[PDB]
Design an enzyme around this catalytic site. Structure first.
Site, PDB file in Angstrom:
ATOM      1  N   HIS A   1       0.836  -1.200   0.000  1.00  0.00           N
ATOM      2  CA  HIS A   1       0.000   0.000   0.000  1.00  0.00           C
ATOM      3  C   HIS A   1       0.871   1.249   0.000  1.00  0.00           C
ATOM      4  O   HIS A   1       0.604   2.193   0.736  1.00  0.00           O
ATOM      5  CB  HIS A   1      -0.936   0.028   1.214  1.00  0.00           C
TER       6      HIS A   1
ATOM      7  N   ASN B   1     -10.111  -2.476   4.072  1.00  0.00           N
ATOM      8  CA  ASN B   1     -10.017  -2.479   2.615  1.00  0.00           C
ATOM      9  C   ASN B   1     -11.355  -2.108   1.996  1.00  0.00           C
ATOM     10  O   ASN B   1     -12.316  -1.839   2.712  1.00  0.00           O
ATOM     11  CB  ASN B   1      -9.579  -3.855   2.103  1.00  0.00           C
TER      12      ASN B   1
END
Ligand SMILES: NC(=O)C1=CN([C@@H]2O[C@H](COP(=O)(O)OP(=O)(O)OC[C@H]3O[C@@H](n4cnc5c(N)ncnc54)[C@H](OP(=O)(O)O)[C@@H]3O)[C@@H](O)[C@H]2O)C=CC1
Lengths: 499, 499, 499, 499
Positions: B72, B145
């Site tokens: 990420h 998420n």
């Protein structure tokens, strides 16, 4: 009922008695329910990963340490102010000297040179005396010692010199062969070695020693005229030394004698103070000076160059947290406000690079944003950004490139440096045999009396005793070059130590 | 006239027009006289070391970068608040849910998963949706998420999964064999892979996707009663996706499409918001649940466990400095205020260790003292001390050990966690053969219509075609375990793509 | 079946096909019994700390990333050899040039300038072309670009320039206003900008571009006589570029177009090669040269200073592990073997400090002990000791200080550097107004044809159109200083795009 | 002629006498022409950046230090081997015990606990005694003390306990009230405190003390049968201590008395040897054991559980470079080969996390690749990749994800852990009130004679007198809980010290 230092925790509880104790939290601020027992499955079962209370404390313990200072690791710190007592605006335009009465917050660190974080204070070694000025023209770090001189006069020998002063790379023991092999091969060290093994080698705490900037520096006034200078901050509490007898006892009885004494002094209102003097040499006087005016192994005689007083240093505050305020202290010789500039001193020039670099290693890239290191009396605005542990607004959405048509910070032409003209070859000049004995000859015969000369050779013989005979004969010969009786005294002592 | 993002510097200068620009200074606060010309000997001479303006700037330039996130890495940030709209105090005693109307400052980071710092925003990948709640009982990091599930359900497979989704260790290229060899060997990924290769694999920016905590969590109320839960953030802006055709165009036309879209939104007052829901499962219902209730590859079907509204997340403030505020953001799932706790989710248990661990490396041991990581609405008091880059009083001269007779912080017994008892052999249990197909079959047959299943296989076949035939046949077989037609549709396209 | 890049693992398995798979171990070498399953109490219980298998894998995963390069992050690597083909020993005494035919191992890294780790390869940008020579006299790092010149001529502007080329400190977006504001205020960038926006701004992979040392260097031969020089290593594959139309398609179709292309080339036996040339200027000719011979925005015209061939650089090996071999590559312009030296080039002067500094940050204090960075064809012996991650014998029990009477390493007097004479005021000399247009005027009228100039203005206008009007009108006049038709052609394009 | 330690450099020169000195090079391998004199402009001019000989030398010096160990900082190292002399294969299947006569290379570090790098060796403190076994099944680190027990029995108290033993957070001094405030509040320390202030608190060097694993460990033979064990590794040189009278004297005369003693012994052929024994407890005996078999403050009496000899550890080699070989030594109790497993000991469980964690900080993420930390008698193969300072091929182009169809390493089912069954509430169980006095009582009454008890109390009172009176009488109260006569002998003396 004991000294104020040992009652530190005692007072803290008293200072808070009215208050209720805080809620014990994780580093993220989450309250802990129990911090004496691990989360386990059954009374005699294994520990869980789910114990995040444990991990967060345990992990931080693991990273408590930072790399210690490569030199001067053992240290004591204090805070106070610098106050101007005379006006020398004719020599320096630095705002720190602007008018009589002006105070500037300071930060001071005292240290030894070779000893590590856990070493004894009352040992024979030079003493560090670094002073940080929080001026409006930015921070000024005068990183000086308790001696006007040093052992070498080129920075390229500094890493070598320190190695010789520390531990053997295999045995990890202090080895006098390293010590004297270096010193005897480099006779320029004769001056500072004579200082070190004298009475002032073991000062009675940090409040009874003088401090020196050692380096020749450059001062620049408002009209753009420049002079060279030396910084002397002499003790108001008076020079007082420890006997080799009293220093050795203390070495095991109180390893932190200097730390405890300074803390106790300030805590009890007995504030130590120093009187800041300068010597001034014009560019003209610099060219006719018999020696190299930027030779760090040379002093300027007081008769020819009298001391001009500037102000007072007063330490009136103990640190609140040693680590946060004294162990994280970073001093940069490159920290010079407008009006104070470096000389071409070979050793000082090396220090302009070394210190900021090492701080980025030891503390971190953003070491200058740590509270005690911050120039909090200046407004920092520039085009520097990011770095690990970025702590402020990072200068916001301000343009990060220069120049720009968007009114980001501008250079200040007033702060331009003095322009000097130099000429000659660009090469490595041999400086090893500038006059190494004349001023040492002077020190031995003129400054010391006969009794101190006697003890001087004794302290020397007692340590030189451990070196090989070929190193000894080399050292004595170097000392004989200072004065024949001086050289003959040391070896006279050595013939007795060699059985 | 242009979009608000590009006019950032323009607006910054307008915001300052009355003020005169600051004096450009060194990190030590010393004003620089010139930062456009180097200090040299003569117009065409060599650079000098005594020029500390250059070094201090250059050395900082050298250290601007810190390690990007291991996953990420590509990120967008915003700030706002969480506001309680319904009462869920019967499930949790957490202060963040205390009463209707209650506001908590939040920090949100949006990200992709595999791409590095410079990659395109509009690619097929899961999306990060991390929210940091600044509560009075410390920070709460709900690190979720845009999907309710994940590809794997054991923490030991995570590094492997990640490696396979990133670059080949030799060619440094994205490798379809790495990607699908893994997925085909771990059929549990069938659920989330089906999600990934559907429409929602490529969200139309960050404002048009939902976020999920995915993990089952524990809620504990004031009586010590416990239930399990799921967190759901549904977009108030509505689900909206990009076609793969327009996502590909934007990938070179606008690598930062999602980042600027968010920035432009907030700056023009159009504030994005999400609605927080929960699902709740009692200890009673968890044991009769058809699957493993802590299986991260499992959802709780809405028929049996409906959404309970909690509040709204609102983003109304953009970062001022991206690096200080968004790049140094650290979310720890282990950061949980009283009232919120972990379930025995194998994956969630693993995340308790990893995040604090990686942050100590990426940012530093004291990363929580960074403004955006700090719990500024709680008081951090503990027996943690020192560490690199210590930035506050370091909790002063407070006693640094526990227990103590000196009124240093105390545990808070109320904040003890809910106690569950567990049993079975302590051993490594195989999770490879939990039901991998039922919910996927459900998703394929019930939730997708004829056109989305059609695209689902096309999006899959379009990527799997680059993998070897033994891998295709292995992957397809896994897809066939879900549904014969699902497997048969993919193999129909693969036979055309294989020429 | 696919390109060699895609078959990396495939070939890895076959190349190993005879052997049995190795035993999977912890970093401490302990064999693992299960690495697909976590150690838990009961099938649905919490994870245990006693699982040191999990911790050891995860903890390493958490630390996988290192700080990326501050510039030139996106990169491709190869290894090979340099072969001398002509005799230039009358100019340099460097061992790398000692005799014709002599081969020296090299390492090459290709990069862009602005893009991050995940950015696209086929964008308009300069290209990195760093070459490390593993000579017996230590490593020689020739860190050059695909252009003979740069945007600026003072190192104090490099941090500024880079900031302007990267992302906005608030929005984290590439900002055309930042980009051209710098360039328009600094007309010296006119030369390199002209290079960048016509055809060679986007090379078709790394093998179809030339490389330049750009900086003027000093060569010193056996007689102690010195000359200045330029390095040109021109492609044997011939200059070949991408059109703006399809170079943009690759940005999204294959982000690693150059990365894959370089790898594929070597693997399929087509080893790319470059022909190394130098230009030579005597100290006398340096004195009559019309511009500053050390102005990095200046070339030496081929008419005045013809190319002298030296040898070939050939890349014939792909890396085995990208990270260990290409991401940990450190090139230091300060790495210069005896016989090759720096000129007083201001930009080059700055690079002498900057590169070793950042490498100590990015990789570590002991970054030179990393295999690819190690000088393995030289004997490293010195008085350097310790430091984080010391990997060898640390030079054993050898004495660590210098000088010494114990036969530790010694100086080599032959290896002293060339002596030059310099004089002038030590001051910051203004170089901002050196000739910014003459060589640029020459490039525009003589080197480009009518359509390449037409395409040149299109590419600039296509990028400058996004800037504010005062920036546009400021930039255009700078272009008009080169040629009236040049400024006016750009301006014709801008007036319609501004509607 | 002097002791072997001091003649290190002398001997180094002899071993080299035929050789001529090496070419002194930069870290990049370039020979330096002069390294005693700086590159300057004119004999008395400023330093140049172009002097890269200086910069890189200084920069490496600047980074010589690494964080010292957070505990056990003062250390001594040696090397030798482990030899199996007896058969205990019915208890353990570990390769280190496979057959009689088998030798295994070891690494040993001796240390104090609280003192820093510069502290004295001869002080009252526990002694670290770490042994690293280089087995074919990976490294086995037996990290033990010179005591069978410890001060506390829960891991959450360890950071707290350590702080109390170190320096005051404000004054940076050893603080007696901190020490005893903690100890008196945690009476479980009475056992270890009683040991510490006896004769063996100050051992005559490292060769005259025993080593203990302290923790209960698990042994597993080929049949999957398990037992619990304690490691007792006894000195062949016989227990020999220093009186506090000469221990105080040696403290200033020779700060590294133990360091020198160990080196001198090994160098003169006088090899120290210790005999490894085990005690064995069956799972059955663990359930009937009167105390907690995993209480680190408890011993297993020799009467019920006699010593079973295993082998010899012999130290026969001195380190060549202390830093590379002894200061970078890393021990992880979590490094356990098949056949050796952890017990549920609360403290030992904490150490599984702590040591790998702290080493990643102190040395680096890739610290296990450091030669002395490397498992060179095992093959490391796994899916761990990258990280700062990667030193080998990084395992080549091998597949980095698991599972895979490409024959990368496979798990070994043989290496599964012993499976145990557990039950209980998951909660924080209080260990504060396990029997804290009984085993201490027998030591005082049965093991010590009348003169050793007298000195035990004298040494405590000699140290406890410095604490506040309210702390003293609480501590005294604990001593009386062991035995009335023990408590007041101490109390009679404190009241004498209280004037
Ligand atoms: N239960 C859950 O939390 C989720 C369930 N699912 C799947 O749906 C199946 C049935 O769920 P059930 O609750 O029984 O019936 P529902 O129809 O109530 O499940 C509807 C869920 O499907 C989501 N959804 C719709 N289209 C897509 C898509 N193309 N990609 C991903 N998610 C999508 C919806 O998102 P929105 O909320 O925006 O409508 C909604 O959350 C489950 O077995 C599961 O596989 C999907 C997502 C989450």
């Amino acid at each position: 009922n004991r000294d104020p230092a040992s009652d530190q925790m005692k007072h803290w509880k008293e200072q808070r008695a009215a208050q209720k104790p805080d809620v014990l939290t994780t580093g993220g601020g989450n309250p802990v329910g129990d911090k004496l027992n691990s989360l386990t499955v059954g009374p005699r079962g294994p520990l869980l990963v789910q114990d995040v209370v444990f991990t967060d404390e345990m992990a931080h313990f693991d990273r408590e340490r930072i790399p210690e200072r490569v030199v001067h690791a053992k240290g004591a710190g204090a805070f106070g102010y610098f106050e101007v007592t005379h006006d020398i605006t004719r020599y320096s335009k630095a705002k720190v000297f602007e008018h009589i009465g002006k105070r500037t917050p300071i930060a001071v660190r005292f240290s030894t040179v070779a000893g590590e974080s856990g070493s004894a204070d009352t040992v024979r070694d030079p003493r560090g005396f670094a002073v940080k000025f929080y001026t409006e023209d930015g921070n000024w770090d005068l990183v000086g010692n308790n001696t006007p001189i040093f052992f070498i006069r080129d920075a390229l020998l500094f890493p070598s010199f320190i190695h010789s002063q520390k531990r053997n790379p295999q045995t990890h023991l202090k080895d006098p062969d390293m010590v004297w092999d270096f010193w005897s091969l480099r006779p320029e060290s004769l001056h500072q070695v004579s200082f070190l093994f004298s009475d002032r080698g073991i000062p009675d705490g940090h409040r009874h020693m003088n401090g020196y900037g050692s380096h020749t520096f450059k001062l620049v006034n408002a009209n753009g005229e420049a002079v060279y200078c030396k910084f002397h901050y002499k003790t108001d509490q008076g020079i007082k030394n420890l006997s080799v007898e009293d220093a050795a006892r203390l070495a095991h009885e109180d390893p932190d004698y200097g730390l405890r004494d300074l803390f106790n002094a300030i805590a009890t209102g007995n504030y130590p103070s120093w009187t800041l003097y300068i010597q001034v040499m014009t560019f003209s006087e610099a060219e006719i000076f018999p020696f190299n005016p930027f030779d760090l192994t040379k002093v300027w005689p007081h008769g020819d160059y009298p001391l001009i007083p500037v102000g007072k240093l007063v330490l009136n505050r103990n640190p609140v947290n040693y680590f946060a305020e004294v162990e994280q202290l970073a001093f940069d010789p490159s920290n010079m406000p407008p009006g104070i500039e470096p000389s071409p001193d070979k050793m000082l020039q090396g220090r302009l690079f070394a210190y900021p670099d090492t701080h980025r290693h030891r503390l971190g890239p953003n070491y200058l944003q740590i509270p005690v290191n911050c120039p909090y009396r200046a407004r920092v605005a520039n085009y520097q950004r990011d770095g690990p542990m970025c702590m402020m607004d990072n200068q916001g959405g301000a343009p990060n490139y220069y120049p720009n048509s968007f009114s980001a910070p501008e250079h200040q032409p007033s702060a331009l440096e003095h322009r000097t003209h130099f000429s000659g070859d660009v090469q490595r000049f041999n400086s090893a045999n500038d006059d190494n004995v004349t001023q040492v000859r002077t020190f031995y015969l003129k400054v010391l009396n006969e009794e101190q000369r006697k003890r001087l050779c004794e302290n020397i013989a007692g340590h030189l005793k451990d070196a090989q005979l070929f190193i000894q004969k080399k050292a004595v010969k170097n000392f004989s070059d200072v004065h024949p009786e001086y050289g003959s005294r040391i070896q006279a002592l050595l013939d007795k130590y060699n059985e």
